């Protein structure tokens, strides 16, 4: 404002700039790694989806948000939020699991009441299979009346793109028993379940990882964004600044003259 | 004198900030034009001549020294202040001290990044 | 500064003014005597200053920070006057290396106050411009030659606006 | 500038423009928050006007707080409702934009004057936010909002 | 042949590779799943993955768990929870763990508790087995 103030401003705007930048590259660092790591994984989770992929097992009849705990640095949370509210009416089961507790925001009210669980420390070292298993594991021991579950997450698509996903969980293991799923062998509701199990993690892992990929990248973007923004402003101000700055000086020197010197 | 007595002197001028104030004050009382930032223009010259008087001399002349440590106490960012600016244009480098750093406990204070010795290596020990 | 700023300059003098047989002037205005000193030997050292030849491709004029501002300022005119000698009289492309045209500027302004003037913006001489104009306008390419002015520019207020 | 500062004392109604707004194309482009008649009052002006005005001044101001934020962010974080109001605020803006006959000549765009009640209604409706779905540009440069409604459809 | 996907979240060994066989100790049993299987789902017992690629080579891994699912079609996906080479698998640990494993077992409890050991026993053993 008064030039000081401007500076006061500026100071911080830079700081911000830096800060924004900090995240930017930082996020990107995390990201940088993260994308690579996606390979076996990608494939892997893509793998997870094997089976339906083939013998597809669908009924006339859960849900589960997946994301980071951290904000909508994309439209991650909101997207699922949307589509899950879209859901909730329709009947699956309205059980939700929110990976990301920024899921638990977007939906968080009677999604203080439609969840089964929600997950946190989502990131802070990119998710790993363990987690997937972890979340899988307790999931198992759940009062899902394992309808048709959905996992809605944002499957990242590319650096600049993600898609809010759903997949359905043949939580009705019986659809998983049914039909075409017959030719299948090791067909026992054992290996069945015990694949469902395994795949719950696999998928979970993946999805989650996608989510997070998305998260890291959108954040990355965001974190750029800001920092150019900063820059611009700095530019804008800075002029106005100087101008006033000197202007100031000038006046006093003005005053100094003929106000304190000529005549005072 | 010492310099000319092949003797090596250290003058610390602490602080020209006050000096300037006085000098202006003086000017003004003398009803004489001061100058930029209300301060006399040739307070630069003043100092210039002063600092021109500090030197590293040919040895032939005893080649003593007068090493000068002027001090200016910032009021922060008002280096822009004419006299600091002056001094900047004069200097052989500046020692920025970072108080913040001091508060961080980082004592020496130094804003090293802005601290500079324009000269560098001739004043440096190979050791160093 | 001193990146071999000077080295480059020295080199420049070398590169053209030797090559194309021009001449150079260095008018060290308001400079540190020390810096002119340093340079001096540096030229000596470079051999561009030759002490065995006063046809060291540069004539040096120094009007360091210890003369009246105007005087230091006027070292600028001086350099000009010489360079004018070499252009017109020596038919040449004189190179006028100036350090710092700023310091000159400040100096002009410096006298103004004392000159009882109202020296305009930033305290700057109102005639800041005229000073500039007239000197700069002295610089050009005459038919006889060129005074190519290479002006070292100090960044007042780290700004140039 | 003190001089205008002074001037103000002699004012009893003011139209303080905003070139700032103007740059945004706008005609009429105002500093709204000092475009006045001192006798701004629900008695003097009807309260409908008044309240609406106070509401308007409010929202727009709030929005005024918000750009700054948005700028230093996006608008995303900022409650979507607010995002809505923000949008509305622009709409209100756009709807304030009033093009003239004499400068259809310039604008290539019709000249307009608006009886007040239709006005109160206008902004009030936008305030009722039902219209909301409709674009800024529908709002831009109109006389009655109705025409804007028309223009919106037409826009669509 | 078969798109044999020998993958692990972390490691894809074969990727839709026209492998002749993988010998494959699902908990179902050890089998020589050959190039282009029948719909079948399999649970991975810890064992070795013996990866008879179409190459004579059969690769060892010891596998912990996961699934290979040997599909209706010719896709075989060993989706190994973790299947690792003996190369990186430390007998020194394994055996040591394993004796211990039973030792611990002795002070273990329920079907599960004992299991934690036993599973391990079983596992570690099957590594020890393997190597």
From Swiss-Prot, chain A:
- Location of N6-succinyllysine modifications: 24, 85, 120, 236
A GO-annotated cellular component: proton-transporting ATP synthase complex
* Any one GO biological process: proton motive force-driven mitochondrial ATP synthesis
Record localization? Mitochondrion inner membrane
Q: Which domain of life is it from?
A: Eukaryota
Q: Which residues carry this modification: N6-acetyllysine?
A: 14, 30, 85, 120, 163
Molecular functions (GO terms): proton-transporting ATP synthase activity, rotational mechanism
- What is the protein's major site of localization? mitochondrion
Q: Which UniProt keywords apply?
A: Acetylation, ATP synthesis, CF(1), Hydrogen ion transport, Ion transport, Membrane, Mitochondrion, Mitochondrion inner membrane, Phosphoprotein, Transit peptide, Transport
Q: How does it assemble?
A: Component of the ATP synthase complex composed at least of ATP5F1A/subunit alpha, ATP5F1B/subunit beta, ATP5MC1/subunit c (homooctomer), MT-ATP6/subunit a, MT-ATP8/subunit 8, ATP5ME/subunit e, ATP5MF/subunit f, ATP5MG/subunit g, ATP5MK/subunit k, ATP5MJ/subunit j, ATP5F1C/subunit gamma, ATP5F1D/subunit delta, ATP5F1E/subunit epsilon, ATP5PF/subunit F6, ATP5PB/subunit b, ATP5PD/subunit d, ATP5PO/subunit OSCP.
Which named protein is this?
ATP synthase F(1) complex subunit gamma, mitochondrial
Organism in which the protein naturally occurs: Bos taurus
Gene symbol?
A: ATP5F1C
Curated annotation (Swiss-Prot), chain B:
Subcellular location, record wording: Mitochondrion inner membrane; Cell membrane
Residues at the site labelled Required for activity: 115
N6-acetyllysine occurs at: 7
Look up keyword Cell division and say if it applies. no
Annotated positions binding Mg(2+): 14
Function description: Subunit alpha, of the mitochondrial membrane ATP synthase complex (F(1)F(0) ATP synthase or Complex V) that produces ATP from ADP in the presence of a proton gradient across the membrane which is generated by electron transport complexes of the respiratory chain. ATP synthase complex consist of a soluble F(1) head domain - the catalytic core - and a membrane F(1) domain - the membrane proton channel. These two domains are linked by a central stalk rotating inside the F(1) region and a stationary peripheral stalk.
**Family designation:** Belongs to the ATPase alpha/beta chains family.
What else does UniProt say about it?
Answer: The siderophore enterobactin (Ent) produced by enteric bacteria binds Fe(3+) and helps bacteria scavenge iron ions from the environment. As a consequence, the mammalian siderocalin LCN2 plays an important role in defense against bacterial infections by sequestering iron bound to microbial siderophores. LCN2 can also bind iron bound to endogenous or nutrient-derived iron chelators and plays an important role in cellular iron homeostasis.
Q: What is this protein called?
A: ATP synthase F(1) complex subunit alpha, mitochondrial
**Organism for this UniProt entry:** Bos taurus (Bovine)
Q: What is the lineage of its organism?
A: Eukaryota, Metazoa, Chordata, Craniata, Vertebrata
Gene designation: ATP5F1A
Curated annotation (Swiss-Prot), chain C:
Q: How does it assemble?
A: Homotrimer. Component of the ATP synthase complex composed at least of ATP5F1A/subunit alpha, ATP5F1B/subunit beta, ATP5MC1/subunit c (homooctomer), MT-ATP6/subunit a, MT-ATP8/subunit 8, ATP5ME/subunit e, ATP5MF/subunit f, ATP5MG/subunit g, ATP5MK/subunit k, ATP5MJ/subunit j, ATP5F1C/subunit gamma, ATP5F1D/subunit delta, ATP5F1E/subunit epsilon, ATP5PF/subunit F6, ATP5PB/subunit b, ATP5PD/subunit d, ATP5PO/subunit OSCP.
What residues does phosphate bind to? 2-6
**Places the protein is found:** Mitochondrion inner membrane
Biological role stated in the UniProt entry:
Catalytic subunit beta, of the mitochondrial membrane ATP synthase complex (F(1)F(0) ATP synthase or Complex V) that produces ATP from ADP in the presence of a proton gradient across the membrane which is generated by electron transport complexes of the respiratory chain. ATP synthase complex consist of a soluble F(1) head domain - the catalytic core - and a membrane F(1) domain - the membrane proton channel. These two domains are linked by a central stalk rotating inside the F(1) region and a stationary peripheral stalk.
Residues engaged in binding Mg(2+) 1: 6
Tell me the gene name.
ATP5F1B
Q: Of which family is this protein a member?
A: Belongs to the ATPase alpha/beta chains family.
Q: Which domain of life is it from?
A: Eukaryota
Q: Which amino acid positions bind Mg(2+) 2, per UniProt? A: 31
> What name does the UniProt record give this protein?
ATP synthase F(1) complex catalytic subunit beta, mitochondrial
> Which positions bear N6-acetyllysine?
52, 57
* Residues annotated for ATP binding in this entry: 2, 4-7, 32
Which residues are annotated as modified residue N6-succinyllysine in the UniProt record? 52, 57
User: Where Phosphothreonine occurs along the chain?
Assistant: 105
Entry binding sites for ADP: 2-7
Curated annotation (Swiss-Prot), chain E:
Query: Chief localization class?
Result: mitochondrion
- An annotated GO BP: proton transmembrane transport
Q: Which residues carry this modification: N6-succinyllysine?
A: 100, 129
Keywords from the named record: Acetylation, ATP synthesis, CF(1), Hydrogen ion transport, Ion transport, Membrane, Mitochondrion, Mitochondrion inner membrane, Transit peptide, Transport
Name where it's found.
Mitochondrion; Mitochondrion inner membrane
User: Under the GO molecular function aspect, what terms does this record hold?
Assistant: proton transmembrane transporter activity; proton-transporting ATP synthase activity, rotational mechanism; structural molecule activity
Q: Which residues carry this modification: N6-acetyllysine?
A: 100, 129
Mind naming one GO cellular-component term on file for this protein?
Answer: proton-transporting ATP synthase complex
User: What is the annotated quaternary arrangement, including any partners?
Assistant: Component of the ATP synthase complex composed at least of ATP5F1A/subunit alpha, ATP5F1B/subunit beta, ATP5MC1/subunit c (homooctomer), MT-ATP6/subunit a, MT-ATP8/subunit 8, ATP5ME/subunit e, ATP5MF/subunit f, ATP5MG/subunit g, ATP5MK/subunit k, ATP5MJ/subunit j, ATP5F1C/subunit gamma, ATP5F1D/subunit delta, ATP5F1E/subunit epsilon, ATP5PF/subunit F6, ATP5PB/subunit b, ATP5PD/subunit d, ATP5PO/subunit OSCP.
Family assignment from sequence similarity: Belongs to the ATPase epsilon chain family.
**What is the protein's given name?**
ATP synthase F(1) complex subunit delta, mitochondrial
Native organism is: Bos taurus (Bovine)
Whole-protein residues included: 37 to 167 of 168
């Amino acid at each position: 404002a008064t030039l000081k103030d401007i500076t006061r401003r500026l100071k911080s705007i830079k700081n911000i700039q830096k800060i924004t930048k900090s995240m930017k590259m930082v996020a990107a660092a995390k990201y940088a790694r993260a994308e690579r790591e996606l390979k076996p994984a990608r494939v892997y989770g893509v793998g997870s989806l094997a089976l339906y992929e083939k013998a597809d097992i669908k009924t006339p009849e859960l849900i589960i948000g997946v994301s980071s705990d951290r904000g909508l640095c994309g439209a991650i949370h909101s997207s699922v939020a949307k589509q899950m509210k879209s859901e909730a009416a329709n009947l699956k089961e309205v059980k939700i699991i929110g990976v990301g507790d920024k899921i638990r925001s977007i939906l968080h009210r009677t999604h203080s009441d439609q969840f089964l669980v929600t997950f946190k420390e989502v990131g802070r070292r990119p998710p790993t299979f363990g987690d997937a298993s972890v979340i899988a594991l307790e999931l198992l021991n759940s009062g899902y009346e394992f309808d048709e579950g959905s996992i809605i997450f944002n499957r990242f698509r590319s650096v600049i793109s993600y898609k809010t996903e759903e997949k359905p969980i043949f939580s009705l293991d019986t659809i998983s028993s049914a039909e075409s799923m017959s030719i299948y062998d090791d067909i026992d509701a054992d290996v069945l379940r015990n694949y469902q199990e395994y795949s719950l993690a696999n998928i979970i892992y993946y999805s989650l990882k996608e989510s997070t990929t998305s998260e890291q990248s959108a954040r990355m973007t965001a974190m750029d964004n800001a920092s150019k923004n900063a820059s611009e402003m700095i530019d804008k101000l800075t002029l106005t600044f100087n101008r006033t700055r000197q202007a100031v000086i000038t006046k006093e020197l003005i005053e100094i003259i003929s106000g304190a010197a000529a005549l005072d | 004198y010492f310099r000319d007595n092949g003797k090596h002197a250290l003058i610390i001028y602490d602080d020209l900030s006050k000096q300037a104030v006085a000098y202006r004050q003086m000017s003004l009382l003398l009803r004489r034009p001061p100058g930029r930032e209300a301060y006399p223009g040739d307070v630069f010259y003043l100092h210039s001549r002063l600092l021109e008087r500090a030197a590293k001399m040919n040895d032939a002349f005893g080649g003593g020294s007068l090493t000068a440590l002027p001090v200016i106490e910032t009021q922060a960012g008002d280096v822009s202040a004419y006299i600091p600016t002056n001094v900047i244009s004069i200097t052989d480098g500046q020692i920025f001290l970072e108080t913040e750093l001091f508060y961080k406990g980082i004592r020496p204070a130094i804003n090293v990044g802005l601290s500079v010795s324009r000269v560098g290596s001739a004043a440096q020990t190979r050791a160093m | 500064a001193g990146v071999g700023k000077t080295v480059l300059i020295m080199e420049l003098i070398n590169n053209v003014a030797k090559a194309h047989g021009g001449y150079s002037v260095f008018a060290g205005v308001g400079e540190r005597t020390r810096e002119g000193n340093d340079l001096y030997h540096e030229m000596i050292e470079s051999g561009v200053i030759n002490l065995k030849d006063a046809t060291s491709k540069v004539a040096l004029v120094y009007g360091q920070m210890n003369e009246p501002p105007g005087a230091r300022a006027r070292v600028a005119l001086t350099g000009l006057t010489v360079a004018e000698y070499f252009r017109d009289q020596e038919g040449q492309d004189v190179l006028l290396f100036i350090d710092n045209i700023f310091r000159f500027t400040q100096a002009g302004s410096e006298v103004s106050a004392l000159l009882g003037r109202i020296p305009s913006a930033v305290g700057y001489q109102p005639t800041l411009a005229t000073d500039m104009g007239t000197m700069q306008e002295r610089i050009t390419t005459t038919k006889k030659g060129s005074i190519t002015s290479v002006q070292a520019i100090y960044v007042p207020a780290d700004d140039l606006t | 500038d003190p001089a205008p500062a002074t001037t103000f004392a002699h004012l009893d109604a003011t139209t303080v423009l905003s070139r700032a707004i103007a740059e945004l194309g706008i005609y009429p482009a105002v500093d709204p928050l000092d475009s006045t008649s001192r006798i701004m009052d629900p008695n003097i002006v009807g309260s409908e006007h008044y309240d609406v005005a106070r509401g308007v001044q409010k929202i727009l101001q709030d929005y005024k707080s918000l750009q700054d934020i948005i700028a230093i962010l996006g608008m995303d974080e900022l409650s979507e409702e607010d995002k809505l109001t923000v949008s509305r605020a622009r709409k209100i803006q756009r709807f304030l934009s009033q093009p003239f006959q004499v400068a259809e000549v310039f604008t290539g765009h019709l000249g307009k004057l608006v009886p007040l009640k239709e006005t109160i209604k206008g902004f009030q409706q936008i305030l009722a936010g039902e219209y909301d779905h409709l674009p800024e540009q529908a709002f831009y440069m109109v006389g009655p909002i109705e025409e804007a409604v028309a223009k919106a459809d037409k826009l669509a | 042949q078969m798109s044999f996907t020998f993958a692990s979240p972390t490691q894809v060994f074969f990727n839709s590779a026209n492998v002749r066989q993988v010998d494959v100790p699902t908990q179902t049993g050890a089998f020589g799943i050959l190039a282009a299987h029948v719909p079948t789902l399999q649970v991975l017992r810890p064992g070795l993955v013996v990866v008879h690629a179409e190459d004579g080579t059969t690769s060892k891994y010891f596998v912990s768990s996961g699934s290979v699912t040997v599909n209706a079609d010719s896709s075989v996906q060993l989706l190994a929870e973790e299947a690792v080479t003996l190369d990186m698998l430390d007998l020194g640990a394994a055996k040591a763990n394993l004796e211990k494993a039973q030792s611990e077992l002795l002070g273990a409890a329920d079907e599960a508790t004992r299991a934690e050991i036993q599973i391990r026993i079983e596992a570690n053993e099957a590594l020890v087995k393997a190597l």
